[PDB]
Amino acid sequence: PVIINPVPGLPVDFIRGVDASEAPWIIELGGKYYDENGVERDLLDILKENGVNWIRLRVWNDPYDEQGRPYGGGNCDLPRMTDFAAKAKAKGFGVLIDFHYSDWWADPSKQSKPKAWANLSYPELVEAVYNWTYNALKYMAEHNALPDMVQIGNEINNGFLWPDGSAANWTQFVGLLKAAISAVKDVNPNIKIVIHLAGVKADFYINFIDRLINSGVSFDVIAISFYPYWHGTMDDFRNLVRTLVQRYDKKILVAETAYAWTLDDSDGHPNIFGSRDLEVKGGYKASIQGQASFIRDLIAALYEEGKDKALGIFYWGATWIPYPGAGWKTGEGNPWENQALFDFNGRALPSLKVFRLVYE
Ligand SMILES: [Ca+2]
Ligand SMILES: [Cl-]
């Protein structure tokens, strides 16, 4: 029962993607996904028929401890992530791989160097990011899972691989950033490079990207993490986009975004989207309709301003349904299930058709 306006002039090759990084782990535990009718189907088939054409997957180097026990949060190591990307690309999907260059979660508040990279000197570290990235993408290419797009680090606002690439050390930061890129192009120079940033502070994007472009860092896409309840209003997003299309001749992408289809909880583990508090920040209400309205408007806002540089969006945590063992951390539960595009029973929400109903 979801009402939605079409987006006039929206290209058929527009990136209407989702981040399904947690899905592979969920399926291994016995988690099941159901289509609009509520019958059990292949997840990728459910996404495709709903209009999703791209898949985004994060990759951690070694999300396990010295005892072999997994960290959690999907346990997104290269072998498990590559197997899903292979099946997705086999089903026609486009693939964006997000190398966090960390053993676990990375964002502008934490950018841990992997356990084996921790005490490598800077020169040895440059040799590490290159050789790992090269072999990483060489691994995916052979399982027929070469990603169309690569994302050098996740939300690298304050840099990555701290402290050696802590943005403060801009010179070293650029060396490591370039080193990874050199690796990607050596595997295939038609793979597109994605620089991912969080927030919609336009004046920061200017300062950061200008210094990046001037440093010789070659990339194709400027990716954005936009969570309205954190980063600002729809208008704040509009101002960022138009500022990027005028100042830069590069593509504009939303690497991460999400909203709440409900406020309830399923597994007893409190969610990030918890109270009506975040609901007044987002400007949209926490219903299945409110979720869909936000997504359609984000696609519209991006294209109406992005013009021919508008690339598309990825809905983050789309497949993160509540399931025992598939929490955000080993031993803990799910804080995101009320922001997925599936309900607690694993059934596709009627707002999943937003990636298809934006057309006409
Ligand atoms: Ca929960
Ligand atoms: Cl430096």
Author numbering: 37 to 396
Q: How do the authors describe this structure?
A:
Endo-β-1,4-galactanases, in particular hydrolyse galactan and arabinogalactan in pectin, a major component of the primary plant cell wall, with important functions in plant defence and application in the food and other industries. Endo-β-1,4-galactanases are glycoside hydrolases (EC 3.2.1.89) that degrade the galactan and arabinogalactan via a double displacement retaining mechanism using two carboxylic acids, one acting as a nucleophile and one functioning as an acid/base. In this article, we thus present the structure and characterization of the hyperthermophilic endo-β-1,4-galactanase catalytic domain from I. aggregans (IaGal). This catalytic domain, obtained from the C-terminal truncation of the full-length gene also encoding an Ig-like and a putative binding domain exhibits a temperature activity optimum of 95 °C making it an asset for future industrial biomass degradation.
As other enzymes in the GH53 family and clan GH-A, the overall structure of IaGal is a (β/α)8 barrel (also known as TIM barrel) which consists of 8 parallel β-sheets (here referred as β1 to β8) and 8 α-helices (here referred as α1 to α8) that alternate along the peptide chain. β4 and β7 bear the catalytic acid–base (Glu165) and nucleophile residues (Glu266), respectively. All galactanases structurally characterized to date contain a stabilizing interaction between the 7th and 8th β/α-loop in the (β/α)8 barrel except for BtGal, which has a significantly shorter 7th β/α-loop. The stabilizing interaction has been shown to be a disulphide bridge in all fungal galactanases, and a calcium binding site in BlGal (purple) and now archaeal (green) enzymes. A slight difference is observed in the calcium binding sites between BlGal and IaGal as Glu347 in the archaeal enzyme coordinates both with Oε1 and Oε2, while the corresponding Asp370 in BlGal is angled differently and only coordinates with one oxygen. This results in a coordination number for the calcium ion of 7 in IaGal compared to 6 in BlGal. From the structural point of view, IaGal can be considered an intermediate with respect to substrate binding subsites. The IaGal contains − 1, − 2 and − 3 binding subsites in addition to the + subsites, while the fungal galactanases are devoid of the − 3 subsite and BlGal contains the additional − 4 subsite. Differential scanning calorimetry (DSC) indicated a thermal denaturation midpoint (Tm) of 105 °C for IaGal making it to our knowledge the most thermostable galactanase ever reported. We find that, while salt-bridges and helix stabilization may contribute to IaGal thermostability, H-bonds and compactness do not, and cation–π and π–π interactions are the only features correlating strongly with thermophilicity in GH53 in general.
